[PDB]
């Protein structure tokens, strides 16, 4: 089919925190069927961020996510043609991200157009004060509603000096053409900066992820 075994990935996201707009593009790739990715990100406009880049990098494509036969592959099906999905990230103290990602297929190579914006970061929280380390390992649980895909994840930063900051991820999977909607199923992640430069001009972010259909797992 269209998804081979290493493929690329191209992006460009456009947005804002608190009102302050920036702009990122990246480059990278990925291998579908084991669930894995890796890219390059580089600061185009408004650097240096004045906020955590952690808070971006979930937004930074669940056609990487090494599904079993036994699981109705609903990313994997809706190329060519692509996906898109929306989402909205809870924090617990009040800020709220919302991110869109339209993902198309030129080739070998994803195209990502992604927004995000994100509002009400207390200038003292974690956010805003750059004391994020990184997001915990996490389970993220898929269901279908009204003829979409629903995905919905407990999420976790570990902060500088001990503790956690949660955010409850809301995310709505539309394939551009009718597939066939899988049953209800959990995806494993594990999203982690590999490298970056000071001010986050240039970052290398990586993730794995795994469909399972039972628990425990």
């Avoid at 302050?20 to 593009?25: K, L, M, S």
């Avoid at 084991?34 to 650097?47: A, N, R, W």
């Avoid at 906020?51 to 996510?65: E, M, P, S, W």
């Avoid at 995806?187 to 900066?193: G, T």
Wanted: glycine share 8%; proline share 6%.
């Amino acid at each position: 089919s269209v998804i081979k075994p290493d493929m690329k990935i191209k992006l460009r996201m456009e947005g804002a925190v608190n009102g302050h707009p920036f702009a990122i593009e990246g480059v990278g790739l990925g291998k579908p069927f084991e669930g894995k990715q890796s890219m390059d990100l580089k600061v185009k406009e408004g650097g240096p961020l004045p906020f955590a880049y952690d808070i971006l990098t979930t937004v930074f494509n669940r056609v990487f996510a090494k599904y079993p036969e036994n699981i109705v592959d609903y990313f994997k099906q809706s190329f060519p043609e692509g996906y898109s999905w929306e989402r909205s990230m809870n924090y617990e103290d009040g800020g709220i991200c919302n991110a869109t990602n339209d993902i198309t297929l030129d080739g070998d190579c994803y195209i990502y157009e992604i927004r995000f914006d994100g509002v009400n970061f207390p200038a003292n929280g974690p956010v805003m004060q750059k004391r994020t380390v990184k997001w915990e390992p996490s389970t993220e649980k898929l269901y279908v509603r009204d003829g979409v895909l629903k995905g919905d994840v407990n999420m976790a930063l570990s902060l500088e000096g001990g503790g956690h900051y949660r955010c409850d991820f809301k995310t709505t999977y539309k394939a551009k053409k009718v597939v066939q909607l899988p049953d209800y199923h959990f995806v494993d992640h594990h999203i982690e900066i590999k490298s970056h430069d000071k001010d986050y001009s240039n970052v290398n972010l990586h993730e794995h992820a795994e469909a399972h259909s039972e628990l425990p797992r």
